Design a protein around this ligand. Structure first.
Ligand SMILES: [Zn+2]
Length: 259
């Protein structure tokens, strides 16, 4: 089906075989280089108005842990930034690596973080999420890096639910959670246009990658990387990494919202 993964056999180098978008010219993630980035004084701040009550479920689909929100109407919204209008929060998920010294998808001046949080939104202008996938700005993602430090209390609440989704196919209720609670102090961001870092890798994403990383504990990162990609009874298989290697920037330009 959508069969894919991050192993050498089913991994990123092979995704284009079944998912031809993977080989596109506007793929993500990318390496950011500050020598190649300027402050764009025209970039506006962004804001969110999330309803914690819009949270619905948490699930393990075999290649990440995802929280899903009610996006049947304009409930939890993201606005401003380089966006043409308000976008609906649909879900958030994470990428991680096998140890703390890597795991992020994007990198900044060569630096890699322990993980990357992606909050996925879409533009109601396009009617549905599925149709939004066919527009270069259909989806808007808030990318947040995760760095090692002190335990994050807000992140802990999320981690406390992982026990319910240890294996692939597991899905459990997850309500009353405002993921804005995870955001760092600064709303400073970089932006550029790219794709999903997972198949089918549609080129429909406006990236709002935050300058400041959220901090979590090494211990929390261990919990995050304790999930399995196998189902309740099978041969336990660890899901220890799910980050995609950097793709060609081509002629795209990343912009900074901050001086
Ligand atoms: Zn992602």
């Amino acid at each position: 089906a959508k069969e894919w993964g991050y192993a050498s056999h089913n991994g990123p180098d092979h995704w284009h075989e079944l998912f031809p978008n993977a080989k596109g010219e506007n793929q993500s993630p990318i390496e950011l280089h500050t020598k190649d980035i300027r402050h764009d004084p025209s970039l506006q701040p962004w804001s969110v108005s999330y309803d914690g009550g819009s949270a619905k479920t948490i699930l393990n689909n075999g290649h990440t842990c995802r929280v899903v929100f009610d996006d049947t109407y304009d409930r939890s919204m993201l606005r401003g930034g380089p966006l043409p209008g308000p976008y609906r929060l649909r879900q958030f998920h994470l990428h991680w690596g096998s140890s703390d010294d890597h795991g992020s998808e994007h990198t900044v001046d060569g630096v890699k973080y322990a993980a990357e949080l992606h909050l996925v939104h879409w533009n109601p202008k396009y009617n549905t999420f599925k149709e939004a996938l066919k527009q270069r700005d259909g989806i808007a993602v808030i990318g947040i890096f995760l760095k090692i430090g002190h335990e994050n209390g807000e992140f802990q609440i999320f981690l406390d639910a992982l026990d319910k989704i240890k294996t692939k196919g597991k899905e459990a209720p997850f309500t009353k959670f405002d993921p804005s609670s995870l955001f760092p102090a600064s709303r400073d961001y970089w932006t550029y246009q790219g794709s999903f870092t997972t198949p089918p890798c549609e080129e429909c994403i406006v990236w709002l990658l935050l300058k400041e990383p959220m901090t979590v504990s090494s211990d929390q990162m261990a919990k995050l990387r304790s999930l399995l990609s196998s189902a309740e009874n099978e041969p336990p298989v660890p899901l220890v990494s799910n980050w995609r290697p950097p793709q060609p920037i081509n002629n795209r330009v990343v912009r900074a919202s901050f001086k």
